[PDB]
Symmetry: D3
Subunit: 198 residues, 6 copies
């Protein structure tokens, strides 16, 4: 059950090879499929390095380290041991913040309440508003929300924004929460396609 790894971006990861001798000499090779990999990388540093015990070391994991990590090693008994890991990664964004807040609302007409912003998450996750602590669902009348998620190409992290409009009453309290989109375990994805736009 432990061939799937979830790892926070920035932090080291060690992947063991089982069957590698505790110390050199060792017959082993690692082959990787990542965001960095064209097809497959192969070795026997600060990118990826092999420890004395044959384990694989990534000094600080990033989105580009997601994918398949495989080892093949000739074991001390002379035959081959296989290792197969799937690495997924995540980032927790900063505290969410409410920008452009209204100080006063006028009952019976629509008002821009504010925008909730989360900066720097992976994967995107979602934002939602509460009013006096209950989840608000958008309707077409008394409420509507425009949300934008935009990804930073220089880091791969996401920014969410959620802008609330309401048509009201007396004295309500509001707040926003960010729920990361991570599930329990392993979602399954097709290989990607890339059509051209004419």
């Amino acid at each position: 059950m432990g061939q799937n790894i979830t790892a926070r971006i920035g932090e080291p990861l060690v992947l063991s090879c089982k069957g590698a001798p505790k110390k050199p000499p060792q017959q082993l090779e690692w082959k990787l499929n990542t965001g960095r990999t064209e097809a497959w990388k192969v070795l026997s540093d600060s990118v990826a390095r092999i420890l004395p015990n044959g384990s694989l070391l990534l000094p600080a994991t990033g989105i580009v380290d997601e994918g398949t990590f495989r080892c093949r090693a000739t074991n001390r008994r002379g035959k081959e041991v296989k290792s197969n890991y799937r690495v997924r990664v995540y980032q927790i964004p900063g505290k969410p913040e409410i920008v452009d807040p209204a100080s006063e609302l006028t009952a019976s007409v629509p008002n821009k309440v504010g925008t909730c912003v989360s900066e720097g998450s992976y994967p995107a996750g979602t934002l939602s508003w509460h009013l006096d602590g209950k989840l608000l669902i958008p309707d077409g009348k008394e409420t509507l929300v425009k949300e934008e998620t935009r990804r930073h190409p220089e880091t791969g992290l996401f920014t969410l924004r959620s802008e609330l409009t309401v048509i009201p009453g007396t004295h309500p309290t509001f707040s926003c929460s960010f729920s990361l989109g991570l599930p329990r375990r392993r979602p399954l994805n097709t290989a990607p396609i890339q059509l051209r736009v004419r």
Copy 2:
């Protein structure tokens, strides 16, 4: 409860610092007390190295890596976070073996049965014999055992030997087991003394 670490010799260990920023710049220093340390080592490679996230990395742990690992880091909020680990280590020896076995015993007199040998353990652990599966206790008459533990100065690992003599009967079966001396958690030791022999 996790400031104590037990680690198998040969294998990498990562110790986190809590409070270090996820990435550089960081104000932090590690200070170590080990078998290598005279008093205290200090840094901010293949001996000991600091990862991008500020964590401490030992590429392959050995007996000489036992001791105290401390971090002090100036946290992102501006004040100081402390880390304190105690590292202990172990090695599993090879399969035990019986050497110099007797093919035949003569009832009513003492016979050298054989020596059970374990090679390459840390800490020493112990050897014990079974006869038809039950633990044998030594007595002064029908049985006696001479045992020797000797440590390799070039590796720190131990060799145990246990030589059985018996005074017997019909048709008994014998075998030896090695029980490592590791307990659950944390034994407590005085600082050592070193008197001179006149």
Copy 3:
């Protein structure tokens, strides 16, 4: 006039020391004040490294490399030569984009036209709109604009947003331009203060 350097983030920079011998041995030391520096760094790698000719090398410049770079070297004639550089840095953001555009406007009432977004600049620079190619100034009636600049703490880069509202007519064309805030040369800044908020 060349003691000030402007350098694009990501790219290498070489700073010469004048007076250093063309090759070793050399008596010289570099001392740095940067975003990384607490007070002053000192040396005689991928952070900062000294080349064979005594020059200073930064392998990929970033915002954290802004500041003062000083060399002191004992010259071939036996006396001392001083070097003093001031490094400033920049990033060009991605192409600006218009998000949430309106397809139709109604004359005589205010309409949300769209938001112009620039992602990933340093320093921030500014956004401005044109209508049929002329600069629009905001007024209080026929036009107003809300703009937000937000900085990414994990990279130091900025995101600008500019949201246009208009009160109109027949058939206008719109577009937005991003003007980086860099000037010709050397603006001068006070040392910073950091009061506490009660």
Copy 4:
């Protein structure tokens, strides 16, 4: 006569290439056959490294460094120079020790005198006892000796043990000596075979 090298384990070895230019550029390649080598290693670090003068450097020699070291280099005159070394290695064990000694012997019956132990030799070498300084040969009656040599798989070094039994007299003195098995020069060995045990 100097193409054979004998080297103590732990210590550096430099092997020259003759014909390599005193400095770069150089056309040369080293190919090795060792305990580490599957077939042949090839290069033009702390495992094996090439010095500026083209010589081969092993930072600390071990049993695994035994074998064939070959260089081929394109010489300054344009044609090829060949180098061929055979490396053999050794370790001196610790002082021998006598364990389990008897304080008293009874004349006319056999007595276990003691075990002489040597720890940490390569190659094994041998142990022998003296009584009042003369070599003892084993017989079947007045003396017999059981000896064991056991090799440490984690280091390749050997432990010898020699257990003396005697059938005596008045007042003899005993002592043991360790004679390393190294000869003058170059013993010759067949390539090994490895049959299977059914």
Copy 5:
């Protein structure tokens, strides 16, 4: 016009690749033709190293770094960008010196005036004498000069010597100047031939 580089020996050189992404991952390879290269070197350290932005770094340029530097990179838009540099190098020699000077000349006969020496130039450049500040041309009678240029095989640098003989008058002043042979731009050379001397 900037695909030709002239660089002083000893000093670093950075060659950019255009089209390489500002940061990793990048698909690119450098191939070099130099004095070090047999045919072509290829990579994706202190010899030649690739910076984070994909640029090529030579830590201290020498005569052996003259030649062709090519990059091929898969650009961020997915297709290929080519780079092509031609590197030439130079060294300024030391101050010229006059050796073996005559204190007195006798009119009407030839006298050895002195030798002007320049040490350590690349390319060779030339020496010439002035008498009361005017260029002297050699004739067959009143003047003649023997000059020697000799190159140091261990460095590639040149030594020039120029020995003046004159047939004189009253009170002339003499001095020598060294004019480096560098031109403006790019001389063009055939590929070399190497006939054998019988």
Copy 6:
């Protein structure tokens, strides 16, 4: 007798420390006085590096590596062992060559015979001529020789030149030999002085 080392420039040198343990941990420090050293260097790479056995490694020795190499080490028995080496260095120059030779001599007047040149020696050594194999001494009449030794500041190596003039006879043969100035062992030198020239 082996605390003095003579080493050819360009080639590696290993200096042992005696008393250092065969392997880490070790308490030792090296302190050096060389052409590179201002006063004394201290350590516990390609400049100078310490091997696993505690020995000192210079990867390619040069004139700048001449001087005093000292080790101090805390030995396995707990007390201190001292090491003290004196390193001297040399270079063999290229084959000597005769330049500017005369094809014909006229008896009864002086003739410039030729210059013998040696390039690239350390220490300087000397040049001498033979005529039909016998050493020529200079006189004031039938022979005289002007010799020049000039040192390359960029390498420290020497160039010798020896220019022969003779006043002759029938059919003599000439040749020149270079005799390096190295003696057997250890010349002794005062510490240097450096007066100023007014």
